[PDB]
Amino acid sequence: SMNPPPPETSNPNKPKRQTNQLQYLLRVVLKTLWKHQFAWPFQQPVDAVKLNLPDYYKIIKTPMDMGTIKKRLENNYYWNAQECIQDFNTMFTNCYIYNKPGDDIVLMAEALEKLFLQKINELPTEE
Numbered sequence: 758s759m760n761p762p763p764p765e766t767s768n769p770n771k772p773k774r775q776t777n778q779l780q781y782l783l784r785v786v787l788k789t790l791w792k793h794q795f796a797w798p799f800q801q802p803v804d805a806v807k808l809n810l811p812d813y814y815k816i817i818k819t820p821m822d823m824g825t826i827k828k829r830l831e832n833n834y835y836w837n838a839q840e841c842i843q844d845f846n847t848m849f850t851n852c853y854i855y856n857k858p859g860d861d862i863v864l865m866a867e868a869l870e871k872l873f874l875q876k877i878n879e880l881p882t883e884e
């Protein structure tokens with residue numbers, strides 16, 4: 758019934774590094790998706806209490822959102838760009854699992870996902 762704590766976005770024990778790929782993920786990928794018209798339901802953790810979804814955290818065991826993804830990227834929480842890419846996939850996949858095809862929320866996740874897959878095709882080469 759209650760919401761779980763938000764996903765961890767900061768750990769001082771984790772090593773930090775900056776890469777051209779992680780910078781692209783926040784400056785290009787995150788910035789493009791955030792401003793999109795369908796982004797609003799994905800900009801923060803699913804609030805199962807305020808949205809009245811009592812079974813959400815019974816179906817979804819790996820919650821994810823762009824707010825958490827952006828906080829992780831600002832805190833230097835990701836070491837590999839693939840960790841961030843998996844997080845975006847998990848957010849899209851959670852939406853498709855909890856909801857049904859043809860739903861307005863699924864059509865919004867599908868458009869964000871198409872915008873995301875185009876950006877990852879142009880992900881610069883490691884340095």
Ligand SMILES: C[C@H]1C(=O)N(C)C=Cc2cc(OCCCCCOc3ccc4c(c3)C=CN(C)C(=O)[C@@H]4C)ccc21
Pocket residue numbers: 798799803808810813851852855856861862865
């Ligand atoms: C599980 C959870 C979920 O998976 N996530 C990610 C988060 C939240 C969420 C949000 C959900 O619902 C949001 C509402 C549906 C999206 C907006 O779609 C429409 C459709 C029609 C209109 C408008 C918007 C706009 C203006 N008005 C007033 C209109 O009448 C027009 C015609 C459902 C599920 C989740």
